[PDB]
Amino acid sequence: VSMTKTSVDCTMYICGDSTECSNLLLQYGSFCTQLNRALTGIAVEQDKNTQEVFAQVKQIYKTPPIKDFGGFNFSQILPDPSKPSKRSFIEDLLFNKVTDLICAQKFNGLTVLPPLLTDEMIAQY
Amino acid sequence: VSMTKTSVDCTMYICGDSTECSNLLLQYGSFCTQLNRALTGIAVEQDK
Amino acid sequence: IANQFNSAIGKIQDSLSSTASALGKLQDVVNQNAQALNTLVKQLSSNFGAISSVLNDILSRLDPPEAEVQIDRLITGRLQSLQTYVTQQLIRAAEIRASANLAATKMSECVLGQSKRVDFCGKGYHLMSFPQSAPHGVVFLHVTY
Amino acid sequence: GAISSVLNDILSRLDPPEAEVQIDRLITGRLQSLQTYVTQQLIRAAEIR
Amino acid sequence: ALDPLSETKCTLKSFTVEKGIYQTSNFRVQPTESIVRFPNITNLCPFGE
Amino acid sequence: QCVNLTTRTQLPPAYTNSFTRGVYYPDKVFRSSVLHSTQDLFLPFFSNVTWFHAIHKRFDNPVLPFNDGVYFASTEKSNIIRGWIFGTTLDSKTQSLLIVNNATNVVIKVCEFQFCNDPFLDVYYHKNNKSWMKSEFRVYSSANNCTFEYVSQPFLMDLEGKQGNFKNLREFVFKNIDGYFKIYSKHTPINLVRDLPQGFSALEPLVDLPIGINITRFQTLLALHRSSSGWTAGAAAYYVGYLQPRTFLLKYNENGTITDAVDC
Amino acid sequence: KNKCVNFNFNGLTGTGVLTESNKKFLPFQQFGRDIADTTDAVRDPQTLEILDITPCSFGGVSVITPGTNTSNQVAVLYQGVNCTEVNVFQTRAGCLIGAEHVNNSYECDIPIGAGICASYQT
C-alpha cells in the first residue's frame, strides 16, 4: 500500500556547500524546482494510499467484553490489550518478519519524511 | 498479455569495439549498470 | 465448522511464523526503495568526466575559469542522475498506487461486504475476510468454502 | 554533434584527448537515446500490465 | 522575506493562501567556527645547533 | 661472496597452491560491517606459488624477478632470514633498496651496493658458548651514493638453531606502485610440517617507503652458521608469488577486521 | 565538540558535528567511512580519540496557516530537526513553533505527521 516517503533537495544534492556551483545551477532554470515538486507530490500520494485503503469507516467498533462466538476463536486475529502497542497475534508476526538507516540518509542529503498515519493508528483501523 | 522481451546491453551498444570509449563509460557510474536492471525487470514481469 | 476454522487459523499462525518468504511482496517495496536511495548517493562520488568529483578540489586547484568548466560537468551529470531517480520513483509510484487501489477494492468487497466474484477473494466461495495490518501494506485472511 | 557517427573513424583521426571531446557528444547523445528507450519500455510495460 | 506568511505568498505566487501546510524554504545549520587539527611536529632537524 | 657453497644442491622449482593468501587492508580508510569490492594487485586464490627451502644439502638463494609486486610467505624456527635486497641490477650500477635486520634494529636504506654471487651473513665456531654474533658479512663488500636512510623500531633476532616442526608463520607483500614502495607484514604462530596450513589471515601495513626506484629483481638474504664455502643454513621454508590485478570482496566485521575474502 | 563546525583534519576537510564515539579503528587506519563511501568518523591526528562526524542539522521549513480570510496567524514547522534557533514544542516530525498543544483529539484539518494535525480553533 504505502511506499517510503523521500524528499530530495536539488540544491544541496547537486552542489554541496558551494556558492559558485549553486550560482551556475540557476542558469538551468526550473530543472531544480521541478525535481523538488515532483517528489513532494509523490509523498502526498503515498499518504492517500493509506486513507483510501486502511480506513473504510468513520466510526470505531469494539468487541464485547464477554467473548462467546459459538465456539470460534478469534483471539489470534484480534488485538491483545496486554501488549504495549496494540496489535493482534498475527500482526505481531507480520511486524517481525518485515524489516538509524533513515537518519543517516537524512544527514546525507536524502530526507525520509514520517508518514501521516502511524502504525498504531493503522492497527486501530 | 505478454510483451516482446528485449534485453539491450549498454556496454555493447554504447561503445562498439572500443576499449577507450568503454573507459569513459566508467566515469558515468551505474548509468549502464542501472539500465541493465531496468530492462531485466520488464522481462521478468512478462513471465508473471 | 468450528473445528475447521479454529484449526485453519492455527495453520495461518504456524505457516506465517515458519514461512518468512510469503511476505516478500512487502520486502520488495523496502528493497526497491533502499536500492534507489543507495544508488542515488553513490552517483555523487563519480567524477562525471570532470578532473575531480570534489568541488573544493577543483576550486583550490584549477583556475577560476577552469573550475567553472569543471563545475558545469559535475552539475550536468548530478542533474541527470537526479532526473533518473525521480523518473524511476514516479513510474514505481504508479505501481504502488495501482496495488493500493486493489487493496481498497478487496477491502470493501471481501471484508466489508460479501462478493460473488470468482477467485477475487480467493479460491472457493467467499464467506468472510479479516484484514490485518502489515508494514507498508495490508494482509487479508479470506475464509472460503 | 560529433564529426562522424563511427567510433573507429574518430579514434583513427583525432587525438585521444580530442576524440574524448567528440566521444562525449556520442555517448551523451546515445545515453539520452538509450534512456529514452528504457523510459518508453517502462511506460509501455505499465500499459501492458 | 518580511514574514513567513509573505514567504508562503511568494512560494505560491499569489496573495491568497488557502488553509493548509506548504514548504516555503529549507533550514540549514551553518558552522560556528573553523577547526584545525594536525599531527605533531616531531622529527625536527636541529638547525639551532 | 663469489665462492659457491660446497653442500648446496640445486632442485626443481616445485609448486604448491595457496588458498586465501594475498588479502590485505587496501589503505588507511577504515570500514566496518560492510562488504567492499577492491581491485588492486593481489595473489589469486588456489594459485601455484614457488616452493623453496634452505637446509644443511639444498640451499636456495636464487634471483627472482620483482615485476610489479610479489607475495611472500615463510615459516621460521631459528629465523634464518635476515632480510631482502631490491633493485634493478642488484649492483652498484644503480640504486638498490635493502630491508634487513642487524640484530639491533631494522635498517632500511638505498645505496649503490657491490653485488655478490651468494650474499648472506655467516657465523662460525659455535659449539659451546653458542655465540651467534655478527662477524663475517658476505652480503656486499661496500656501499656508496646513498639517497635514502631509515631506521625502524629495534628488534633482537634470535638465530640459535632449533629443531622440530615450524612454530611460526610470516607472510609479507612486496610491491611498488607509482614510485611508492608498499610493504605488508603479518606474524602468527602455526604448527606446520610441510606445504602450507589451511586458514585465513589479514595482512597489515608495516612501513611506508616512498623510494621510487625501478626494481626488476630481488633476493632473499639468509643467515649461515657452522659449528665460507663450508657453511650451512638452518632448516627453513619460504615461498614466492606474483601479484595480479584481481578483485576481491573484503568482508568487514563489526570491529573492522576482515573476516573472509572472495575472488570474483 | 558537540557543535556544528568546519573541521580540517590533516588533508581532510568538511562541515559537521564532532562527537567522540566508542568506535575502534585499526591502528594503521586513521579515517573511516560508511557503506556509502562517505567519512562517518575520524581519528584525531594528535591525541588518541575517535570522532564520529555527524553532518549538521538541516531540513525543510513548512508554514502552517489558515485561509487568508480566516486569519493571518502563522505556525512554523521544521522537518527532521528539533528546536534549535527558536509556543515552542517538539513532535516526531520536527520542531513546531507558533501553535498550542491540545490533548483533546479532533478531526484532522491541516496534516503534519506522526498522527498529528493542526487547525484554527479556540
UniProtKB/Swiss-Prot annotation, chain A:
Species lineage: Viruses, Riboviria, Orthornavirae, Pisuviricota, Pisoniviricetes
Annotated S-S bridges: C10-C32, C15-C21
Known outcome of mutating D68Y: In strain: 19B/501Y, Omicron/BA.1, Omicron/BA.2, Omicron/BA.2.12.1, Omicron/BA.2.75, Omicron/BA.4, Omicron/BA.5, Omicron/BQ.1.1, Omicron/XBB.1.5, Omicron/EG.5.1
Record organism: Severe acute respiratory syndrome coronavirus 2
Top-level taxonomic group: Viruses
Biological function: Precursor of the fusion protein processed in the biosynthesis of the S protein and the formation of virus particle. Mediates fusion of the virion and cellular membranes by functioning as a class I viral fusion protein. Contains two viral fusion peptides that are unmasked after cleavage. The S2/S2' cleavage occurs during virus entry at the cell membrane by host TMPRSS2 or during endocytosis by host CSTL.
Protein name: Spike protein S2
Site residues (Cleavage), renumbered to this chain: R87, S88
Effect upon mutating T111N: In strain: Lambda/C.37
Glycosylation sites: N73
Curated annotation (Swiss-Prot), chain B:
Boundaries of the shown chain within the full protein: 729 to 776 of 1273
Official protein name in the record: Spike protein S2
The encoding gene: S
Function: Precursor of the fusion protein processed in the biosynthesis of the S protein and the formation of virus particle. Mediates fusion of the virion and cellular membranes by functioning as a class I viral fusion protein. Contains two viral fusion peptides that are unmasked after cleavage. The S2/S2' cleavage occurs during virus entry at the cell membrane by host TMPRSS2 or during endocytosis by host CSTL.
Residue pairs linked by disulfide bridges in the UniProt entry: C10-C32, C15-C21
Curated annotation (Swiss-Prot), chain E:
Region (Disordered): 28-44
Glycan-carrying positions: T32, S34, N40
Effect recorded for G48H: In strain: Omicron/BA.2.75, Omicron/XBB.1.5, Omicron/EG.5.1
Domain of life from the UniProt record: Viruses
Functional summary from the UniProt entry: Attaches the virion to the cell membrane by interacting with host receptor, initiating the infection. The major receptor is host ACE2. When S2/S2' has been cleaved, binding to the receptor triggers direct fusion at the cell membrane. When S2/S2' has not been cleaved, binding to the receptor results in internalization of the virus by endocytosis using host TFRC and GRM2 and leading to fusion of the virion membrane with the host endosomal membrane. Alternatively, may use NRP1/NRP2 and integrin as entry receptors.
Oligomer and partners: Binds to host ACE2. RBD also interacts with the N-linked glycan on 'Asn-90' of ACE2. Cleavage of S generates a polybasic C-terminal sequence on S1 that binds to host Neuropilin-1 (NRP1) and Neuropilin-2 (NRP2) receptors. Interacts with host integrin alpha-5/beta-1 (ITGA5:ITGB1) and with ACE2 in complex with integrin alpha-5/beta-1 (ITGA5:ITGB1). May interact via cytoplasmic c-terminus with M protein. May interact (via N-terminus) with host bilirubin and biliverdin, thereby preventing antibody binding to the SARS-CoV-2 spike NTD via an allosteric mechanism.
Protein name: Spike protein S1
Full protein: residues contained: 292 to 340 of 1273
